Structure formats: C-alpha cells, structure tokens
Symmetry: C8
Subunit: 246 residues, 8 copies
C-alpha cells in the first residue's frame, strides 16, 4: 500500500546512473557525475560555470559512460534566455560526436512565467511516460527566478512558497519515478542561495560554484565543512567543463 520492500527498492536503485560533468575531479566530488533519481542544484555568481555545466551536460548525457550508462536524450527548460546551441558545437567537437545528432537529442522550451514553467513540467512528465529510458536528463536553468518575479511583494509569499513547493515535489517525483537526473541552476542573495528551506530540501545535492585562480573554477558542496575533499577544481574551455591544465 504505497510501500515497497527494501529489496524492490534496491532493484530500482540498481538502475541509478551518473552523467559526467566533463571534469574528473568534479565527477569524483559527485560520486561519478550528475546522479539520476535526484535533483542536483548548482548556484553561484556570474561566470562561475553554471551555463557551461548546463551546456556540457547537454552533450555528455548523450555519450556512453561509466557503469554501463548508454546515453540518452535531454530536456532543457530555459527561464533565463541563456541556452545557445552554438556552444554545443564546440563541446560536441571535443567529444567527437556529430553536431546535428547532438542538437536533435535535446528538447528545448522557454518559460516566461512561473505558471508556464509548471505547465512545461507537466508536459515533461507526459513525455517521460511516452517511453521510459529514452530521456536521461532534465535541465532547468533556472529553477525559481520566475517565482521571485511573479511573487515579488512581501504579501504574496504564502502562495509563492506553496507553488514552489508543489513544483519541486513534482520534480522530485519525476526524477525518481522515471529514473532521470534533474540538474537545476539557482541564484544567490545577501551570499546564500535563494529558495530557503523548500529548495534546500528538494535538492539532494547542492553545489556552490566560485572563481578560482586565473580561469579556474571551484565546486563545493554547500553547507559542508571547510575541507578539501568537499571541493573540486575544474576549468572552463570552448569544449565545456573540463580538467585543469596540470
């Protein structure tokens, strides 16, 4: 009655996969990469790597990977007007895969309001149902910019939080029922990530991105102790997220 045995749940989790970020150290930080049946959130300031990571995953999710990962299709929801297919050209070149094939395997939609964003996710649930195992990654860049927009006054916050919680619980269910990785970007405020308890709870992994030495970037697990193991160095290139020169 709404319950599985731990054995049945184990059978379900044996299908969990990781999508490489393109950086070895970053993957190790994540235990292999962006994990399915979970929401992974990346937040930071501008030029920390959020967009490069989103675009890189658009390519790596289509590639055969570790643990028998066969690759698959991607859904990209864009609230920021930042998706640029041309970036995928350089990234696909790096990974030696055809441009048009990469572009044919990414489905894309702009969201202009928070209500629209929620409608899109209902469409996404239907598409994942059409045939499971085809799509492996859902990207939302970004997760709640539109919720700040649509409920900006300090009197409408109750409805904002309710709508946000509803969307995120549906996003959790989507990730876990259909065995897809959900990657989302988020903004910061006076810094801390926005969304409060709701977004903190919904995300299974939260990554703070900041600038490193020169052109290097640093990824860290948010609210984790200040220790090196909880941090990873990566570089940004025309080929996407990658490893430092070394």
């Amino acid at each position: 009655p709404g319950f599985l045995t731990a054995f049945e749940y184990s059978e379900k989790r044996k299908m969990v996969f990781h999508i490489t970020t393109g950086s070895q150290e970053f993957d190790k930080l994540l235990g292999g990469g962006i994990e399915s049946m979970a929401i992974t959130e990346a937040f930071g300031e501008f030029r920390t790597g959020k967009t490069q990571l989103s675009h890189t995953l658009c390519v790596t999710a289509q590639l055969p990977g570790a643990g028998g990962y066969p690759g698959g299709k991607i859904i990209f929801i864009d609230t920021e007007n930042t998706f640029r297919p041309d970036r995928l050209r350089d990234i696909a070149d790096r990974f030696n895969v055809d441009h048009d094939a990469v572009l044919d395997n990414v489905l894309y939609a702009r969201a202009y309001t928070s209500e629209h964003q929620m409608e899109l996710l209902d469409y996404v649930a239907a598409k994942f149902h059409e045939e499971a195992g085809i799509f492996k990654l859902l990207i939302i860049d970004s997760i709640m910019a539109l919720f700040r927009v649509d409920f900006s006054g300090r009197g409408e916050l109750a409805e904002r939080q309710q709508k946000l919680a509803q969307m995120l619980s549906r996003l959790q269910k989507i990730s876990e029922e259909y065995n897809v990785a959900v990657f989302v970007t988020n903004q910061m405020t006076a810094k801390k990530p926005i969304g409060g308890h709701i977004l903190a709870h919904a995300s299974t992994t939260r990554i703070s991105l900041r600038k490193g030495r020169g052109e290097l970037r640093i990824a860290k697990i948010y609210d984790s102790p200040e220790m090196p193991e909880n941090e990873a160095t990566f570089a940004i290139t025309a080929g996407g997220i990658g490893d430092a020169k070394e």
Copy 2:
C-alpha cells in the same frame, strides 16, 4: 472505567516493552537497552553525526533476536530526505552475519513528498500494523518534520502547521503505544532542534548527535545536565553503528 485501565492491566501491557540495540553497547546503556517500544525516540544533529547510519543500522538490528527477549521483527521506513540506501544494509547485514535478501524483504519503504502525503502514509502504517500485530517492531521516519517546514514556510500559516504537526505526532504516540512498536525519528536543527514544544512533548527520548575526536561520535540526552553518564561514545563503520575501538 470508560477509557481507563487499572495499573495492573497497564503493567501487563508494559511488560511487553522491548529495546532494539543501536549496535553500540555504550549507546545502548545510555538508552536503557536501545530504541524503546511504546515510545518515540528522536535523534537530531548536524551533517555526518550518525543519524543516517543509525537509521540504517536499526533496519538490520530490529530483525535480530536480542536482549530482554526481543524476538526481532519487520521495519517500516518513511523517507523524506531521499537518503535510504539498501546497499548500506548489505554491509551492515554482513557485519551481523545475516542474508542480504532476507534483510531487504523485512523492510517496507516509502518516500514522502509532502506533509499531507507523510500523514496519509502513517494512516496506512496503522492499518498494516493492525493487519497482524507483533509482526512489525520498528517505524522509522527520516525525517519527522522537514516537509512541515517546507509546506508551511511563510508565517501566518504557522497555526495550521502546528495543528497538523501536533495531530501527526499524537497519532504517532498512539501508534507506538497501541501496537507496541518503537518509533525512531530524525530531526534537523536551527543551535537547537526544530519543532518547539510540540515535538519536544511528543518524543519520550531525545538524542543530540555530535562529532567526537577523530572519527568518533557522541550521543547525548538533550536538555540534560553536562555530565558524562548522559553521554556515550560510538563509532561509524561500513558495518553501521558500533563501539569505539579503544
């Protein structure tokens, strides 16, 4: 009387109270034998303090014959954090020299995505325990009110949050005491544990977990005087909660 028992009848009922070993002798002594039936035991602390290791360890130890005539039984696990991992149970089962698949078959598992969902799940749990009493010995809720923080984050709805929270916890008390099961729940901090008077009253035993020297952990009775007897040292391994190797 209507709704009253004699102290003798109640004594007969309490003679069947049991404890489930935590895997640590010192922790068990602190608890008077382990996680106690006809009661709610709450464990709270920061990240990597032992909450998840204790939850998973209890999934195995609740199935083993133990002290005080404890015969072992089945477990129900409600997961609000997306943290349950059967593979941890395999390592802990190895430690206790018991079959993996048998351990996994004896744990019923459900994710909760909203506070309303969590309460519905607990109504199903009452039905399951009732189907045949004495089969299930442990109900785990990891965690008890993260979803109430989520669903009632803006103030002005706090009254309804407190009412729903109190209602769930009074039902939990009645479940633990009517069906003689131990209820183990985890909780977050904000440091002091969240939940205020409601959760403080509902729990019969409250445990703060914190990091000790090196890889050791420390369990303490919350709101108790600063004295050694109210504290216990334990260790965390791939085999679960255990004793320090001194």
Copy 3:
C-alpha cells in the same frame, strides 16, 4: 440559593483529609500531606521529585493514615508517558503492602490531546459520582503540557486560556464536591511555572522542587518569603519520597 451556612460548610470541611507524601518534613510543610478539596501543584526541573512524588502518592493514598484517613483508590491521568507500575512495586514493598492490590486500586489513562484530557476529566467526574468516598486522589501528570502543544502560536492563545480556565474550574469543582485531593505536576519556563494567572489561581498549594545536597531534594512554597519554615528537605529512594538519612 447556591449558598451554604458556615455551619454546613464546616460539616463539609470536617471530612478534609491529608495524604502523606512519605516524608515527615514534607508533610509538615503541607500541614499533613496532600490535602483534599484542593489542587496541589508541584513544578520543577527534571530529577527534582515530581515523578517520584506522583508514584509515591499512588501507594500512600491507599494506606490508613493520620486523622482517621482510611485510604482509597486513585485516578492517574498521564500526559507525559511517565507512569511506570514497576516503581510502585518498590514503594509498596517499603510500606509492606501487596503489589497486585496496589495496582488494582489505581485507574490509569493516557491523554494525547488537551481536548482528550478534558474528556477524561468529565469521565472522572462521572466515576467519582458512581460512589463517593471510594476514590481519594486524582493525579494529573502534567496539567497543561498538552495545552501548550495544541495552542502553540501566538494567535490562538485566547482559546487556549479559555479552555485551560474551563478545565481548571471543573477540576476545582471536582476536588471540592467529591472531597478528593487533586495533585498535578507542571513545567517551568524562563525560571517560573507556566500557566500564568489561571493556573496560579486554580491551585490552592504550589510547590517548587529543586535539587539539594547530593541526592537530597528541597520543596518550597512558591512565591513565599525566603525563610526556612517555607522549605523542607526530603530524599528520593527506590521506596519513593522519604526522609533524609539524618
């Protein structure tokens, strides 16, 4: 018309009795012990003697005592999940009375909500009516923990105070109409006892319990001048509330 002569009231008060606490000095502090036709409130921190006193009275109320007190039955309402018949075994042993007889003379009920607690007290009024003089003591441990639980927000206090006042006025009437002692425990807050004017007015005697030297305890009349006569020393043993070594 709702009035008695002072003579008739005197005839009524001539039946007032005291139930020994088990401690001579404590009894002297109370004028003989826990007094009938009145509410006596004991508050303090943990391990001050509240539970030991409740359990001790479960036995002493059944014993013949000073002033021709013949002993009688007890009703115990438990909001804290702290009643333990096993404690009564040691206390009965101390007073050389049979265990099963002691347990048969105590009626017991858990209250899980404040509304439930009030319903229980309405049942209690009916039971006392069935035959007066059978029951001599009503214990409520504790008096208003559940009222803090059920009305925790700062907007529901009006209804909380009204419900609390209603319960306590009925408790006063129960104690005085049926000539029973009412003993209740209470918590403290930033320390002072909770309940404010309502509980202060309802209780005829209020006792602060605190830790003394070593294992000794101290009982005092709350809000009374700082003088020795208003204080008493007692000890806690397996046999319940008792006198210090001396």
Copy 4:
C-alpha cells in the same frame, strides 16, 4: 424629580449608615469607626498581610452589637480563593465570647469558580437582601477580580473584561447603597492594586496592608500622602484582628 431625592430625604437615608469594627481600635479610627455601610471598602496587599484575618474577623464582629447603634446582623461571604475556614471563626468567636454554632449559622457562604458565576451569585445576593431588609449587614468578596484576571487573561478580550468588571462593580455599589450593607472586598497587587480606574472608582475606601515590625501589620489609605494619621498598626492572633500590645 424622577430618580432624584431631596437632600433631606438623602440625609434621612444616610443617618442609618453604620460601621463594623475591624477588631482593632487604631484600624477603626483610621476607617472612621470600621467597615462602612453604603460603600465598598477594598483591602489589598501581599501574602500574610491580614486580608484573610480581616475577612474572617468581620464574619464575627458584624454579628455583635457595636458603636453608633450598630445592632449586628448576618453576613454573606463569596470565596474565589478557596480560603474561607470556619475553624478560624471558632477561635475568633472564643475571643469575643460568643457561641460557635450561632456565629456559623449567621454566615452564608458560596464559592465562585468563574467570573460569570461570581456575577450570578451577586444577583442572588440582591434577592436575599431583598427578602427581608435589615437582616444582612455585610457582604464579603474574597477576592473581587481574581476570576476576571483568569477568564480574560489574553489581551484583545480586555474590552469585554473591563465591561463585565464595571457592570459587576456598579451593581455592587447599588447593592451597598440601596440595602444599606457594608461591602468588603480583597484584591491582589501586580506594586499597585489591579483593576485600574474601574476598581479605583467603585471602592469608596481603599486600604493597603503591609507587614510591620516583628509580628505587627500596618494598614494605610491607598494613594494618600506619607503621613502617620493615614496609617494604623494592628496585630494578628488566633482571635483575629486586634490591637498591638505595646
């Protein structure tokens, strides 16, 4: 006129005003003879300042022929504090050399458990005085508004508290002045007496009681200049309120 008397008619009415001795000559001088009829006299102070001794002493002295042609009469005692004790009246009766049972037969007594109950009782008192005027000489309310504090403790209902309180006190004034009885009431402090403008206006005389040297007490006119004539020393004994033995 309609509702008006000539000063002569009012003079004839006031010629029947009487005083009830407090048992203390100095206290009586302070009051102009004792507790005055056609008026409310309020006594307030801390614990063990004399309020209860004065209430009980008046239960006896109101029955004795006295100065100014006072013939003695019966007493009504409304008890909100659970403090009335006929046995005190026996000791005070002994002092004044009068029979116990006669003293007790001449005092009518009722407990009030709510403010609404207290007001209902006062309506019955008006009826009783009316049954045959000149029989009752004293109405005691110990205490006047503890129950109003209880029944309206949260703010927001303060308006209704003040309205009910004012209504009761205007009725009390009319009772004292229409039926030529002295009204004596006790009150708490919070230091200044509670009740604000309403109780200040309703009472014709207000007395603060405080502790003097050793076992002596001091009565003072409230809000009066710091001068000796506005103060009186009295003593408390088993025989009630009396004069200091200097």
Copy 5:
C-alpha cells in the same frame, strides 16, 4: 433663523448672575463667583477643596447675593459617592439659615454609569423646563470619572469621546438656555486635568486647586500665565469655603 441680534442676546446676558464661593478673594478671581450660562470646572488632588466647594455652593446658591441675585434651588449629581448632607449643617449654621430648608432645596441623584449620568441630565433639562428661574445651580461631582470607567480600553476611545462630547454640548445648552450655573469637578492625570480638548472646550472657566501654607488652599485659572492676579488664597473650615485668617 437660529440667530439672535446682539441686542436680544444682551437682554439675555443681563440676567447672568454669580454664586459666591464663600471666599472674597476666590469670588474676585471669578468675577463675582460661579457664573450662570457657563460651565465652571474645578480640578485638583485630594484635599484641595473640590468637595468643600461643592457643599458650600449647595448653601450659598440659596442665599440672596450681589447684583440682585435672589437665591434658588440646586441639583447635585454624584458620581463619586461623596455628597454628605451633614456638611451642609455647619455651612448653613455659618450663614445663619435653617438646616431643613437648605436640604429641601437641593435635589440629589447618584450616577452609577456614564449612560446613567447622561439620562439624569436629560431629566434635569426637563425639570429646569417645568419652571425656569427656580433652579440656579447644577453640580456634577465628577464630570467624567464614569466615562473613564465605562471606556477603559484603548480601543473604545472613539465612542467614549463621542458620548463625552454629546453630554458636554447638552450641558452647555442647559446652562445657557435656562440661565443656570453649572459647576463640575474633575480629576487629574500624569499633572494635567483629564478630558483633553473636549472638556477644555466645554468649560468656560477652569480652576486648578492646590494646597497652600498650612491649611490654606490656592485656586488658579488653568493654563494661565504665572502671575498673582490669576491666583487666590482661601481657607477651608467647618463652615465651608472661606477667607484666610488674615
């Protein structure tokens, strides 16, 4: 149309009279005494002369006086329970007039609520109409103690001010239509007189009373410059308000 010529109004004002206070200097301060077609307000602390002045005017208003004043009857409204016909005996003795005659010419009523006080004033308007020129003085001791009583919370002030303004405008109309002096007493608060703008506007003359040397008193025009002409010394005796020894 609701207007008189200044000539007709002059004819009306030619009938204005003064009632001596009993003190020569006090009368000079007032231009002859208490003036008709006007409200005169006296405020101060206790034992400043308010009651002595009220009682003195009860006698002097009946005496032939300066400017052809023939004397007349008085109406006394008592909100404070302070009117004492016996004081008039000594005052009448001073002025060598019969006691019973003085008492027969004063009509008296207690007011127990502010609504009652307003009803009484409506009765007074009717009585003055029965035959003008019979009554010369209306005393209200005090003017708004009952309005503070009936509207004590800070939420009912709107209705309080409206009722107070309505009463005072009717009082102005009574004084000016029927050519009677209206004398009222008032309390002070943190000192300043209570009533604010409403009472300040309604009163044509306002008098502050304070204690002078020894048993002397001082009357001053409130809010007037600090100069001797705006002040007068008077004495209080068994014969009422009078002149200093000198």
Copy 6:
C-alpha cells in the same frame, strides 16, 4: 465658457472688494487696509493676544463708513467659545461715537455647540446673505475649528474630520467670494496653528498675534520672513483695538 469669466468680468467683480478697519492704523497697513472681502482672514495666538478684542472691535467698525468707499453694513457672529459679550461693543461704540442699540441691532449672533451645528449655521448664513445682497459685510467665526477638534479627537476618524473641515472651508470661500463679504475667523495653536494644510489653504491671510512690551500687542503675517514690515504694533483698550500711544 461654462463656469468661466473673462478677466474683465472678474475685474469688475474685484473692483467692489473692500477692507474693514481693525481700529489700528498700523494693523490696517499690514493688512492693506483692513479685513478684506472676498477672502478669509485667520487670526491665531495664545490667550489675551487680541483675538477677542479684534472680533468685538470688528463688530463695530464693520458698521462705519470707511476708506475706499466702504459704506458699512451688518455682521454675523458665530460663537463656538462662549466669548461674545455685547457689553464690550458698548464700550467700543462709545469710542467711535455711535449708539449702542443701533450697533447691537446690526449684529446677528448664534452659538455653535457641535461641528455639525456650525456647518448648518453656515448654510443659514448663505441664505441670509442671499435674502438681500450688500446688507451684510462681515462674517465672524470665533473659532473656526475648536468643535472639529472636539467632535473628532480620537484618531481613526481623522479622515472624516478632514473631509468635513475641508467641506466647510470651501463653502466659506465660496460664501466670501460670491457675496463679497469679509470672513474673519480665529484659531487655536498647538507652537503652530492647528488645521494643517486644509486651513492654511482656505485662508487668504493668516495673522499671528503675540504680546509685545508692556500692554502692547504684535500682529504678524504667519510663515513670513523675520522682517519689520511683516509686523505691526497695536494696543488694546476698553474701546477695542487701537494704536499704540508712543
């Protein structure tokens, strides 16, 4: 146009504007001739600054032929302060060598007891002026908004106070400008004059009155720079407002 005049038609209307001498040459120079028609002139100040003397003096000077072809006329006086005294007009008439009864016949007088009454009176004034234009030259309101302070003293009704006040003052402006009468009003201070923007806008000229050296007074244009031309010295005598005898 509908509701518009040519500047020529308006010029013809303004050619009939007149001034009423204050009795003081220097005051008149300050005002450009005296109290001006088709305008409201407001005078405010403390007690005994000249407001009442000016009001009464104008009652006489408005009846005298004067400078600029002023022919004299009748006066309407609305009295909210109970300060109008025809006998003052007799002394002022003596100064100007005119008959008393003629002066008194030419002043129409009414008391206002409420703000609603004051507004009703002004509607009657509009009717009277209309009965035959050119008869009345001066409308005095002493004072303009004391009764609005009275009738709306508690906040929360301030909106209605401001609306009623604005409505009365716009009617006053229209009365002054439609019927070519001077409107003179007195006002209180709280220092700055009360009435805020509403009264500031409605008045065309505002005069502050204050005490000068010895028995002299000073009139000044409110809110004007500190310069001598904006000030005038005048004297007060039994004959009214006059010039200083230097």
Copy 7:
C-alpha cells in the same frame, strides 16, 4: 493604429511655439519661453516670482512673438485666490497694449475642490475643441494644493495619487493634442516640490525659483547639475517679469 509616423509627428511638432516670460535670460533658459505641447512647472517659496510669471504670461501670450507666434487667448484656473486683473494693467502698459483687450482674452475660473479642478479641465478640453488655434496657454495656479487639501490623512493617499495621475495625464493630452502651453505652479515641502513621481513625470520642464541679490530672482532647472547655464537671473517690476538692470 494609435501610431503616427515620425514624419507626421514632425509635421505636428513644427507648430510648436514658445511664449516669452518677459526676461531674455529666462527665455534662453527655456529655449525661447514657455513651450507648447508640454507642461512647465514653476515652484518655490513666497515672493520668488510664481505669481508675477503667471500674470506676465497672461499678457505675453497675446503678443506676436518669435518664430511667427501670432498670440492668442489664455485660460487661468485659480486654486489659490491670487489672480488679480489689476496687475495685468501695468504689464499691458509695459507692452503697450490695451487693458480691456488683454482682459477680454483671458478666461478665468476659481477651483474650490480637487474634483472641481478636474471638472474645470474637462470643460477646458471642450473649449479648446470648439476651435483650435484660438487659445495658446492654460495656467493652473496651483496644480495640486487642492489634492493635499482633499486627501490629507495618511490613509486616503491611494485615491489621491490616482486622481492626481488621472488629472495630469489628461493635462498632458490636452497640451499635446491641442498644441497649447500648460504652465502650472507648485508648492514645496521639507526643500523639495510636492507631488512626487507623478508630478515629476507629468511636467516636461520644472523650474525652481529663489531669491537673488536684492530684488533679483533666480530660475533654475530642478534636479539639474549645479552649473551656471542651468540658471538664469531675472527681475520683478510693476511691468512683470523682466531683465535685470545691468
């Protein structure tokens, strides 16, 4: 569809004209004078030149001027009761034009309420329609004094701002549809001009007027950098706004 080509709009703007202020430097500051198809706002303290400028424009708007300006008629809305045709006599004399002709070309109306002011502007729109090109200037002295009057409390501001915005948008439309200059005066507050964003946006040019040396005045563009080019010196004479002696 509600749009013009830039060419058609150019044809419309080619008819834009300027009305000289009477001061050469002031005109240069304005680019020729008061500009049509726009609102020009002048604010300042008293005696800064607002009224002199209004009256001067009443004459100069009728005079042939630079750029082929033929002169025309004027509408003057007066909320302050300050328009004086006699001033125009001296100004017309300066410009050598007949008095009666100047006065016949100015239409005039007083506004007594803000609603009235808005009704007047609706009449004005109709008059401008009767035949375009006849009227060249609309003066409003002042623009929103009556809006402060009619909405003075801090609770009615929403409706005030809405009404003010509505009037000003209609005023913009009037100026631009009928090719007329709109000149308005405004007050200042704690200094800054009143009206906030609404009036700031509606006005195309805003002029601060202040006192200069001796009798000279200074006009500046409000909120512009502190530089000489943004300022102009002018003089005030019986002939209106003019150039300094030099």
Copy 8:
C-alpha cells in the same frame, strides 16, 4: 513535444539573430555587435548620460544595412517621457548620409500617458509585427516603467504594480523572441535601477550610462565586476552616438 523544439530547430531560429549598431564601435564591441534581437536591452543612468541620444541614434541605424547580414528595417517608438524629437533624427540621418523623409517614414511613434495605455500599445505592436514579419526590427520603449511608478506610487497597490509590470515584460520577451526584433528600453534610477527582480530578469542585457571626462560618456554592464572590458567610452554629437576622437 507540445511547446518544445529540438535544439536544432532552436539553432535555426537563433541563426537569424542580428545586432543593430549603436553608432559607436567600442559600444558595439561591448554589446557583441550592438543591440541584439530576440532580447531586451535596458539602458539606465542619470540625466544627459546618453539614453535619449542612443534611442534617437538607433532610430536611424536600425534602418541601415549592417554587419552580420543585418538588412535594416522599421522601428516602433513608444514614448512615455515626451522626449522624442524627429529633428534629432534629421541631424543623425545627415551623419549617415540618408534622406530625412525616408528615415522619418520608417519610424512609427506613439505616446503613452498611462501604464494601461502602454500595455494596450504593446498589444497593437504585436499585431503590427504580425501583419508582415521581417519588416520591423526594433521596438524602443523610452521609458519602460516610469508610468508604473506613476500609476502605483502608494504602497498597498505594489502587488498589482508588480503583477502588471511582470505581465508586460513577459509579453515583451515573447514579442522579441517570437518575431525576432530587438527591444531597447530606457529606465530610471533611484543609486540602482528601479524595477527590482522583475525588470532585472526580463532584460537580457543591462547597461549603465555615466559621464566620462569632458564630453565623453561611459557605458558599462550592470552588476559586473570593476574591469575595463566591461566598459566602453563613446561620444555624443549632433550626429548621435559616436566614437571618441582620441
């Protein structure tokens, strides 16, 4: 999918994105070529920083064939500030050696007088673009939300202001992206730009304009680090926005 495109289809759509030169090479480099289509570009700054010169310059440059295959097209200009001046376009057209009347015929222009009017105008714009796509290339809104400040200036209506503002800006985004037009808007500051999160999110590029040395101006990417590449120097001439002559 329903509402989704493949990345390839979206790539084909973005291949038609164009840039409109600002007239300044350095400014263009800062913008990646100029004002970009399928996006909103916002420029804000103080007075005389270049906002109006840029708006007018774009009216001409949008009509010229340019880099990246830009063919030129028509412009829609919505004017909330009353600042559009075709004569400026004549000077700028001269600089670029193009006919005046042709330039003016290719700009459609409308004033907005209210925020509701502004939104209605944008609905007409959507219709016009749709009449035949590819004709219009640029929509200018000068300025974007001055009228929203005006129409919702009092707080309490801020919720509705934010909702209307968000709705307009989401429509603007959809207009820019559906019909492949560049949207250029100006904005005020209060220093930081007004509009909060809503306007920050809606604009894809935000430019702060400030004054440089002498007559130079500086354009910067808002909220970007203090670095030279994020800034550009340009000059303002009668010919519009141009490069500095160094």
